[PDB]
Structures are given as C-alpha cells and as structure tokens.
Design a protein around this ligand. Structure first.
Ligand SMILES: [Zn+2]
Ligand SMILES: [Zn+2]
Length: 197
C-alpha cells in the first residue's frame, strides 16, 4: 500500500514572473465564441482542448497557478488543438505561446499524468465530467493534465493577464467564483503524494 503518484512542489518564491506583449482572445464575446465553435464543428468536427495544472507551495500549502484576464475571468493555461495534433505536444506548444520567454530560452515542460476529461454537449456553457444521456455528437472534448514544474523558472506573463497563486481552500465548493472544472481541482489533486521542497 503505496499506490499514489509522488510529485515535487517548490516554493512560489522560486519562480520569476516577467511581462510580455498582450495576448488577445480569438473571440471578442460569448456570442462570437459559440458562432466560431458552430462554424468549425461543420468543417472539422468536435473541438479538442487541453489545459495544464501547474502547482507551487508557500510554507507547505499547495496553490494552483491561474491566469486572470484583467479583473474578470480565471482560466487555466491551455487552448485548442489543431486537427491531427498530439494532445501532449499540443499542450506544450500552447503553454509556450502563453508563458514562454521573450529571450527565447525553452521551458522544459514535464507532462506525465491525466487529471480529468470534460464534455460540452451543445454550443452553450454547460460542461460535464462524462458524455450526457442521448448525446452522440459532443461539441467539445477538454483534457486536463498535471504539469510538473522544475525547481526554478522565469515565466513571461502577457501584459493583459496576471498569473495568480490560488490556495486549494479558496477553490473548494466555489463554482460561482471559478466554475465547475477549477472548483473541482482540490478533489482531483487529493490522490497525489506532494513533496514540499
Ligand atoms: Zn515556511
Ligand atoms: Zn471525446
């Protein structure tokens, strides 16, 4: 009886958060977001997204790194795969596009664990951790992965975003604040054996 995955965590003060130019969303509104999902579904089928969960600690208290757009939405680092693109290579590409350095030194992203799977049945906000009853053509499949960080790193945060460290207690039972995927991270992370370096 030791069946848990062992993960190294480092202090938040081990990481440098630099700045770079703004990164703009492909969609200028909720309505434009669901119009483009409908157009691409007709051309290339189900949307495939990938998201990274990056963990740090301070004084042995785990925190998840979240992207905050101005003072509005919280999001995980991630995005949309291209057709025929590998999911793990894709997440590594997207995390470099978002947080990768202005001096063009490469982060060594380490991805070895699936956290979870969510499905969007319609061109509407609702997402579920399973394909709902009667749904044969889901509109989006989202995959979450645990990203093991190095001991130290410099991240370049686009100037229209803040990288924030959220403690697990603040996420727990807080779907109104964070939505159904981020608010269930405490439950999804509980299986790991974290080492507080
Ligand atoms: Zn301490
Ligand atoms: Zn699927």
């Amino acid at each position: 009886s030791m069946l848990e995955r062992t993960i190294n965590l480092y202090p938040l003060t081990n990481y440098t958060f630099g700045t770079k130019e703004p990164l703009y969303e492909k969609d200028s509104s909720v309505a434009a977001r669901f119009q483009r999902m409908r157009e691409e579904f007709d051309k290339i089928g189900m949307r495939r997204t990938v998201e990274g969960v990056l963990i740090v600690h301070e004084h042995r208290l785990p925190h998840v790194l979240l992207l905050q757009l101005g003072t509005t939405f919280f999001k995980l680092p991630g995005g949309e795969l291209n057709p025929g693109e590998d999911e793990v290579e894709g997440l590594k590409r997207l995390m470099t596009e978002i947080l990768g350095r202005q001096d063009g030194v490469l982060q060594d992203w380490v991805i070895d664990d699936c956290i979870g799977n969510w499905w969007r049945p319609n061109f509407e906000p609702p997402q579920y951790p399973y394909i709902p009853a009667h749904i044969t053509k889901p509109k989006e499949h989202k995959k979450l992965f645990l990203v093991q960080l190095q001991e130290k790193a410099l991240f370049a945060v686009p100037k229209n975003y803040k990288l924030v460290a959220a403690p697990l207690f603040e996420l727990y039972d807080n779907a109104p604040g964070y939505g159904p995927i981020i608010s269930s991270l405490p439950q999804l992370l509980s299986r790991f054996n974290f080492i507080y370096n």
